[PDB]
Amino acid sequence: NLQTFELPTEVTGCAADISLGRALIQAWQKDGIFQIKTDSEQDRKTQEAMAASKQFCKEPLTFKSSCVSDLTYSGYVASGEEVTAGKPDFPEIFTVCKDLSVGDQRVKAGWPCHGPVPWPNNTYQKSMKTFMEELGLAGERLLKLTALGFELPINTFTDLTRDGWHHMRVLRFPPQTSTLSRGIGAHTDYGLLVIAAQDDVGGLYIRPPVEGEKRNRNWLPGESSAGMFEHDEPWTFVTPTPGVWTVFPGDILQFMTGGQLLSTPHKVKLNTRERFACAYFHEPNFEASAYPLFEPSANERIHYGEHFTNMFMRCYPDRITTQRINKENRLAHLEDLKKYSDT
Ligand SMILES: O=C(O)CCC(=O)C(=O)O
Ligand SMILES: [Mn+2]
Numbered sequence: 001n002l003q004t005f006e007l008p009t010e011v012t013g014c015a016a017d018i019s020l021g022r023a024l025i026q027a028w029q030k031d032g033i034f035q036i037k038t039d040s041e042q043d044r045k046t047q048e049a050m051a052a053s054k055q056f057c058k059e060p061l062t063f064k065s066s067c068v069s070d071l072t073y074s075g076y077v078a079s080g081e082e083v084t085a086g087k088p089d090f091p092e093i094f095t096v097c098k099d100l101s102v103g104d105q106r107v108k109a110g111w112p113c114h115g116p117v118p119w120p121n122n123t124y125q126k127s128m129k130t131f132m133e134e135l136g137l138a139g140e141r142l143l144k145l146t147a148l149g150f151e152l153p154i155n156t157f158t159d160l161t162r163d164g165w166h167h168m169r170v171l172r173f174p175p176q177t178s179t180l181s182r183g184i185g186a187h188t189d190y191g192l193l194v195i196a197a198q199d200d201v202g203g204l205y206i207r208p209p210v211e212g213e214k215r216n217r218n219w220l221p222g223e224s225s226a227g228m229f230e231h232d233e234p235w236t237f238v239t240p241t242p243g244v245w246t247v248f249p250g251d252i253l254q255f256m257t258g259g260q261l262l263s264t265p266h267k268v269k270l271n272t273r274e275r276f277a278c279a280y281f282h283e284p285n286f287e288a289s290a291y292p293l294f295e296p297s298a299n300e301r302i303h304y305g306e307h308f309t310n311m312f313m314r315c316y317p318d319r320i321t322t323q324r325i326n327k328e329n330r331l332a333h334l335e336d337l338k339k340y341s342d343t
């Protein structure tokens with residue numbers, strides 16, 4: 001039912017790249033999502049990542065809970081700690097942020113959220129790193145095609161995503177265990193571009209754009225999208241399909257395009273067996289600021305590092321990472337890093 005596209009290995013800006021970019025935009029504007037074909041290596045790396053996740057989630061909770069850091073938000077989040085629209089969600093999550101050693105200048109300087117991933121083991125680490133490298137190559141192709149489809153300079157988005165704050169939620173949803181099956185409530189993702197992968201079980205639903213339907217700007221405090229539309233059609237079931245990933249826009253793409261793209265609402269229904277999935281977020285650099293592309297006189301911005309840091313401090317207010325940000329006033333580094341820049 002969803003449209004499927006094959007991305008070229010390199011995007012150069014030829015007229016055929018532009019036509020493809022236009023078709024991607026159209027598919028987002030019609031369906032809110034599309035599929036991209038994966039080759040055998042991309043597929044193999046996806047399956048290996050799922051298998052490492054399955055093996056890790058079988059480890060005792062005492063061990064899983066130890067995969068945490070007071071420097072980065074990377075690591076384990078137990079089920080029931082995350083909340084959407086006020087109702088706790090069901091998946092357990094391992095978040096992979098940029099994996100920076102304590103010798104990296106940003107970690108040495110104590111920038112908020114910067115630090116080494118607390119990996120469960122080296123085998124899990126290698127599976128996730130090599131999967132995320134392929135996801136990143138796809139994200140860059142997608143962002144060049146999107147710029148081209150809007151008749152923007154080819155590097156409009158990728159200039160912001162150099163050394164971008166790419167990160168991935170590695171998710172396991174439990175089987176249904178009662179009448180309740182809302183695994184994650186309706187929400188939109190806070191980032192730029194989302195690439196999603198899943199096993200064969202099934203449970204992700206997305207909402208296409210709806211003519212005449214008002215959508216909130218979820219990056220603004222007084223316009224949360226959480227919970228909206230949850231019990232009203234249309235919700236498109238994202239059918240597990242071999243040999244594809246799916247792609248949809250996040251809040252920052254809605255912001256930059258002034259709503260010409262909408263951040264795709266999505267939710268997860270628990271299945272009668274456990275379900276593994278990965279949600280990859282291809283993001284601006286921690287120091288980059290998103291801006292409105294088509295309203296040049298608009299002064300509003302989204303400073304990405306501030307956006308991410310505030311989000312994660314609110315989501316995990318008791319995590320050791322948040323406590324150390326507060327104890328050491330790490331937010332002050334964000335203020336400092338903008339001091340002498342051209343706004
Ligand atoms: O891909 C999925 O299963 C949903 C994950 C999701 O919506 C999220 O992590 O924000
Ligand atoms: Mn999401």
Ligand SMILES: [Mn+2]
Nearest residue numbers: 082311312315
């Ligand atoms: Mn969150």
